[PDB]
């Protein structure tokens, strides 16, 4: 309860920093989320390892949206 | 849940909407106990019971 | 080349050039690269030429 | 003869600490984002051309709005004593703009409003006609 | 009497009212006045305030917190700390000879150009407020440094708060 | 020529004169008409006289007078200091200097235009100074009662007014700070209709 | 209703009519018409002579009028400044603009949850008195803060 | 007698950093939009200029959602003009919905031109009192 | 077990290690209650609980 | 709870500030600005006349220095020595370098938990005052140690 | 060059040496993984990683 009323008291800066509406594309479609990594090395067993310099991957696929999200479903 | 109002819903998503000639709105969406509405440039919360 | 204004008076103006050239000009005279000056505004830093170019303060 | 360092404040909260820890990285990401974007494309266009300033436009307006644009720009035109005009249809998805600014000029307000509108709508001002005008985007 | 807005940038007459209400005598009022006006008591009042003083050799320095003594993200003067400001002027009146250097310092977050602009504007409005009391303009020079050399550590929230400051140095000759 | 001192209600008119330096001392209506480029460093006028000079191409000069002359000066001269104690009127066309110090006590009507980086101005009473179209990087102004100042500061502005004083700036500096004690007033005095007017910034929103 | 507010927070109509009675006894013009409200203040009661400078004693009255202002619910607040005729039209318009700007930014520094605050000044263009003997002492030199209460 | 500090004072070391970061990220997004936005000069913006003839200075209240040619012909009838058409209607006719209570006729025609897109345009001759609608290829 | 730190692990041997753009490392390894690390040129021991 | 430590071992901040006060009243200069601490010692309190011989009575003072110093948590310490102009640059820099090296080695031998110790002397290049009346009695002959408090 | 995925760990235990032989002993304990070069004219200390694998 204390941390929730503190969260509500510090109100406008959350929506100030999380301006999700700018991220949306022209056709009102949610852009996807992309994962990054650098200097990865996996050892399969002894005498066999494999190292990549950087890697990238898709977390969730892009899809349509009707209204932008906010911080309330995340942090409350 | 289907809601008839005149303001604009913000938070929980909405499956479909319809607007009158007078600007009043009707929304169809999934059930939620609490909705977010920008009333007159100021945000506002609404509590739903009986779900 | 592109010139800039340096000092503005009713009647005369100061031109400073990209080559470092310095010039004092009347209300109307032939000027290099811009033709003929027809208007001097002392309220705002805007002088238009016969070539249509308007000189402003450099930034 | 005791010793004190200068900065004294109220006690803080660990949630606010974590908020700062997230915010510094987000700000760095947006800083390098804007830097790289400015590197990639050269700007060529300025909206001060298409909406120049005028007289009776220097009255100051401090504003925190958190909704759509239509009532806001109608209130602005009513304060500015100018006619207001609308072009195109409002789409089914409403356009929402959040603004929190401290008493600047109305032309700067309109330029920033059109900037945050972006590709959705455009703003034109005819001060000779004393008319502010919105126009929606024709797309889809 | 007195005007709370800096007494309209005038040399105040403070101890005369104290010795008048002491007589209402004069000698005990004057010795209490100079006990208050001892420079050690000035340093004690400045340390009651959040101002850090360092004496070293012929050079003396003062440290002023930007956040408490100034309006946030703005060169607007914080109006509350004017007793400390009057104490600052009273302490600075003792050295009418040497030149003074003034500097501003910030944290590590933001555009470096933005830090430079805010720090330089901060230093310029600080030295302007100082010049308004009657110092010679040729005796002054200001610099707003950015995050170039943090006297605290910007890894912690508390240290990043402790970083931003106003630093005033002056020599003897 | 090296020295000219005139007293006693005369008129000297000359054109196309070139000299490295000469010293001029004018008194009792020495009506001077000059149409040549003359370098000089000292010029003393007692006052109550007119002087037409078109063109002084000199490195440095110094002017100090106590009377009420009528002087209009052309050329490109760097100055060091200027003091006024009477009812002085002066106009100058171009000044290309580095640092100027102006003090006006009794009655001053001085119009200036040029590029000088550093300016210090002190006004006591009944002085109206016009550094309109005089672009300055650094400005430090102190005004007492019944004083009018017109400034054109570019980068750094320091303004101090006691009372009864008007401080009008015709350029938005990158740094502005000011203090008024009793009745001083600092105002923007601009046009509000300029097509290329620039507004405040975050650093420039110094609310008075 | 036990889990709902009975009234608006920090609201007392008796307090409101009390403080408007106090301000009318002081002399600040409080005008109520419909749901629109005007507050007119003389220029000498707040500022110094021909100058955008504030007396230190005025802050109690400014805090009181901010306390009255933060009671109601509003959207847009309009501030208009008016003066006498002193030097020139540009001088008077700039002075009124500066005074309105200062009082508006202090009012937004104080906690009243507006959405838009507009500030402007006109000088001596719209006097309200034929009797114009005074300068700042004249009652037509004034500042007006107005709004409409909306539900 | 007492100047008060602001109510929303950032009097905490976390809060000042939070507000400063918010200011910085708002500036970053604003500059992103500034470098991102593509606009047009108002010298060559393809919009219908106003011929401002006196028949267009009236007002009306019109609600409509459908085709274009019959609406323009009725507008020219109310303005006592003549109607001219060049080109052919497509397989699907152009549909424009206009709802208004008070306007200018020239404003109506300008918004018609705005909603027409590139497939059709209009021209007004105010000397020989006619309005023409032109199709594209 | 999957650990996340900007420090450097010494003792137990990890199956895989990856890094962020800020240098913060993540490790996949087997369960071990005591870790040996270097903090700033000094060796420390760390506790693992819930095993 | 009792397995994990509550504080850093052997640390009492009240004792730290009390011995700081006693050291400053003894005359050894203590400087605390931000996270950085600086200790200044006059050379006449340490050595003989331009010679790197340690006084027998100075070992108690050095013990007090080490006892205060091991209270903190540190990584790197730096000690520099300065003097007055006597013969050359070379002789003076050599004397300062030797004095700094021997005091750093004794401190590293003593029980202060650090990682890195840097030591250097600069002779008489950068003084703190223009009052050069004394020789080794002059306060520009000095030894400074510096560190930054970590975490 | 870039540091590899396996970090380079260096253990030094000495006392009262100058920085030149400190760097020399650092280089000798480094092995073939890295090399150290200096440019005292430009006041530059440079590390370089070995290009293996």
Numbering used by the authors:
A (entry chain MC): 77 to 152
B (entry chain FH), I (entry chain EH): 311 to 361
C (entry chain Ef): 208 to 266
D (entry chain ED): 23 to 162
E (entry chain EL): 42 to 65, 88 to 236
F (entry chain EM): 113 to 320
G (entry chain EK), J (entry chain DK): 38 to 188
H (entry chain Ed): 24 to 160
Q: How is this structure described in the published paper?
A:
The pathology associated with infection depends on bacterial delivery of effector proteins into the host via the membrane spanning Dot/Icm type IV secretion system (T4SS).
Using 3D variability analysis, we reconstructed a total of five maps that displayed differences in the way the outer membrane cap (OMC) and periplasmic ring (PR) were positioned. These maps led to the identification of an approximate 16-fold symmetry about the center of the dome positioned within the OMC. Within this dome there are 16 α-helices that appear nearly identical at this resolution. Indeed, a model of the C-terminal domain of DotG generated in Swiss Model using VirB10 as a template fits into the resolved dome density. However, we have unexpectedly uncovered that the Dot/Icm incorporates only 16 copies of DotG into the OMC dome out of the 18 DotG copies in the PR, giving rise to another symmetry mismatch within this system. Based on the structure of DotG modeled within the PR (residues 791–824) and the homology model fit into the dome density (consisting approximately of residues 857–1046), we hypothesize that DotG extends from the PR to the dome, though a physical connection between the two structures is not observed. (A) Two DotC were observed in the maps that were reconstructed during 3D variability analysis, one which contains an N-terminal extension (DotCLong) and one which does not (DotCshort). In contrast, the N-terminal extension of DotC was modeled as two relatively large helices positioned near DotG and bridging adjacent asymmetric units. Notably, this portion of DotC was only observed in either four or five of the 13 copies of DotC observed in each map.
